[PDB]
Structure 1
Amino acid sequence: MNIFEMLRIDEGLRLKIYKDTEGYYTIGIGHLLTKSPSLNAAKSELDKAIGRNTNGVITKDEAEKLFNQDVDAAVRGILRNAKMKPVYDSMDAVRRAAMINMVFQMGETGVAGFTNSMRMMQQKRWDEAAVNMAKSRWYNQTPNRAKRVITTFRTGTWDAYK
C-alpha cells in the first residue's frame, strides 16, 4: 500500500468526463477539470491538459499521466505551505499519505480549515484529532472516504484500506 493505490481506491478511474460529488466536471483519477457548469468549458480544459482533441475521452495511460502530475503537485503544495510543511514533516510515512489524500481531494484551501486538527496532529494526539476532523462538511459529504482517511491518521496503519 502506498499513496497511489490509496487515492486510486478513493477516487476510482473514469475515462469520460463525469461530475464529481460536488457536481463538477472531472475525469481520470479525481482530476477536477473545472468548477464551471459548462461542459464545453470542461472539454476545452481537458484538451488543454492532455494536449489533443480528446472529445471528452482519454485513455488509461493519459489518466495515469494526469494522476502522477496531480499527486506530485499535492506534495509540493504541502511542502511550499508554511503552515503545513511542519505538520507534514512531524509525521510518519503512513500519516503523511493521509495528509496528501486530503490535499489531493480538497486543495490546500480546504485543508487549511483543519488548523485545529492539524495542531493536535502535530502534538501527536491522534484520537482527539480524529474526533475533531469528523466535525466537518468534508466528513458530512463523503463520509466513507472521510472515515478511511481519519482512521489512517488515527492509527498510522493501512487497515482501512485492506
Structure 2
Amino acid sequence: SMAEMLRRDEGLRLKVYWDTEGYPTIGIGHLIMKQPVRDMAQINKVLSKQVGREITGNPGSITMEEATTLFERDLADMQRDIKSHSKVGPVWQAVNRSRQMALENMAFQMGVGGVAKFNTMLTAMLAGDWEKAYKAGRDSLWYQQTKGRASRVTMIILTGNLESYGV
C-alpha cells in the first residue's frame, strides 16, 4: 500500500520538524506551510485549521490518528492531481500498479510538477523502454540528492514489481 511505502520513505513525526529546505513538516511528510517559516504561532495557527483542533506548544503535537488523517488527505490530493496532469497522467494510465506507485511516490516527494520535469523518463515509460527510463531516473540530480529512495523507486520502474520495498 502507499501508506506503508510512504511511511517508510518519509518517516513518522507527531511533532513539527523542518525539512532540508526549511519547511515545517509533520506526520508522514505533511507540509504544514510552503514557506521556510519558523514562527510557531503561525505554524500552530495553520496546523490547527488543517487538523480541526487547537494546537498549542513550542512545538506542539498531533495524535497518531491526526497524522493518518493528514496523510490520507495528502495522498488523495496527489493521486487526484497525478491523473489529471496533461503529461504525467497519460503515463500513469499506461503502466501497471507497481509503476503507478513509483510515480505517486515521486509526486508525494516533489509534486506532480516536479515529476513532469522527467521528460526522458516519462517518454520512455510510455514507450515501455524500462531500461531507458531507469537510466534517465538515475541520471537525475534527484537521484544524487536522495539516492536511497531514488534507487528504490527507479528499481520499480525498471522491474515492474515492488521487491525493492521488500514486497
Q: What corresponds to 2:116 in structure 1?
A: 112
Verify the 8 A CA contact 2:21 2:36 in the aligned structure 1. Answer: no
For 1:53 and 1:84, the matched residues in 2 are separated by: 37
- Is 1:20–2:14 an aligned residue pair? no
Verify the 8 A CA contact 1:36 1:42 in the aligned structure 2. Answer: no
Letter matched to residue 50 of structure 2: A
Verify the 8 A CA contact 2:45 2:55 in the aligned structure 1. Answer: no
Secondary structure (helix, strand or coil) at the match of 2:14 reads strand
Pairwise CA distance, 1:95: 0.5
For 1:37 and 1:91, the matched residues in 2 are separated by: 36
Letter matched to residue 107 of structure 2: V
Q: Bigger shift: 105-114 or 47-56?
A: 47-56
For 2:45 and 2:143, the matched residues in 1 are separated by: 32
TM-score by length of 1: 0.94
* Equivalent residue runs for 1:1-162 within 5 Å: 2-40=1-39, 41-55=42-56, 56-162=60-166
Query: What root-mean-square deviation, in Å, do the aligned CA atoms of Structure 1 and Structure 2 show?
Result: 1.2
For 1:21 and 1:159, the matched residues in 2 are separated by: 28
Which structure is higher in RCO with an 8 Å CA cutoff and minimum separation 6? 1
Pairwise CA distance, 1:5: 1.1
Secondary structure (helix, strand or coil) at the match of 1:18 reads strand
Pairwise CA distance, 1:36: 2.2
| Identical columns (%) | 43
For 2:69 and 2:164, the matched residues in 1 are separated by: 26
Give structure 2 stretches of 5+ with no counterpart: none
Give structure 1 stretches of 5+ with no counterpart: none
Aligned residues: 161
Pairwise CA distance, 1:38: 2.0
TM-score by length of 2: 0.91
Q: Bigger shift: 149-158 or 19-28?
A: 19-28
